[PDB]
Amino acid sequence: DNHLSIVTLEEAPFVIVEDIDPETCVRNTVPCRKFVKINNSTNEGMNVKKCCKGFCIDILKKLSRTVKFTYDLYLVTNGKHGKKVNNVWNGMIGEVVYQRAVMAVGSLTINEERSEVVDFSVPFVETGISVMVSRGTQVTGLSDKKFQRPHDYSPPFRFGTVPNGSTERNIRNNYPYMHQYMTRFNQRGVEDALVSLKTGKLDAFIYDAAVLNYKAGRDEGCKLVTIGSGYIFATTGYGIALQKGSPWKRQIDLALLQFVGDGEMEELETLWLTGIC
């Protein structure tokens, strides 16, 4: 039990996956496998061996040293971060719920409905829900009327999100009319949403605050901005999702809290989230 099964999900700059040397994972990368199907009828597949790096990856390494545990790393393939579908959890959350991963590492937002099924560590990356535009807006935020009641304009505002995450889960519970309006503007990923913003097809992109602040700081020409100059709704953070009652809950937080007072979270903050804009 000194060796743990750990699940992760790719989302720059926290978890970045690159193809391996056609032999080992070099530099600051850690070996991480990904179950890839053979075809779309058989359940048969193969674990392709890749290399993972980023903010949450080094966080895993620092905790791997201080807490003294070995691990294998694997990318989630049934979903992404996690969503309760027909009272069944998928994604990284589902991997911990059904005892296929001892802990989950990555840009895993801590919300209330997940803490009912898993145990979250201390938030080590502040995040939430922010709005990204490009550019020239006077909207206050999500509580701005234009998101609340879109059709009170002719034309209404065209804003969307990437579904099945903690962001869409929050807007559905809080704003029923806004949520059913955003469904036509749902983006398949963060890269598609940025393209839609700069091409004029999308007016605003509602997503995780930490990722938006990262993408806004690395924009060519400093055109993507988060409104409020960085305002965040439903403030929370990324957290290591563990089993409910996990005996590893006692050091991960104490060692993460150590990383804060030590001055090591600052390094990875200036290592991976240093912004040009």
Binding site: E112, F120, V122, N174, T235, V260
Partner: protein, 257 residues
Amino acid sequence: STRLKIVTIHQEPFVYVKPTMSDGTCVKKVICTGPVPQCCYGFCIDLLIKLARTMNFTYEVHLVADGKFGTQERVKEWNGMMGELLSGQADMIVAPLTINNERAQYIEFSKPFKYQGLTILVKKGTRITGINDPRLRNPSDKFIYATVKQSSVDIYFRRQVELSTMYRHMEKHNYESAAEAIQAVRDNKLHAFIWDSAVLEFEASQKCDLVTTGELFFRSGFGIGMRKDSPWKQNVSLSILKSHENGFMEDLDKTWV
């Protein structure tokens, strides 16, 4: 089977402290016993009241005796609110208590109900670049800066040997409470106050003679204080997480902060 004993500390805008009227009574106000029945209200009090129904429990608020947050000093014992929670005088710390490593080793923090950080408060007209200003890095008794005694900021400057000198100049100038240090900056004998931004910049928004500088040089958060065995931890954290999502913590931030 018993009322929960709530320990709080005077720290506006989170917790105000006012005296009872001649009738013995006092927005949502709760009678708090402090060094004497007093009146307490604010951010942390509304949050305590919101916790008390979500969980359906009765409580009694009383201020901390020594008037401190809590640090571990050698005779090792905890002072401030930390000691009262560990000794049994308290069952729950509802206050702007900073979550750090040393405190979490003994008590159980809930998920943070307030995300913020550390900044520097100065008298408007005094210019320092930030925490890395030469008047703070290489200090002199010409420029006086300090923090609050027996606080989390005091722990932050002493647990790193590189910050050993920034700490020693403060070691002689630290104050017993934040309120004394803030007005001391107005009287121009405290030149800089290093404290949490949730308190400093808010008071800079009400007293237009002080200004916060350098923005945040270190991030920290506020969590509910509980012992290792409090059977409310699971539900306190869930209530805080739910309070963050439903835009309700945001209501308190506009109401008080």
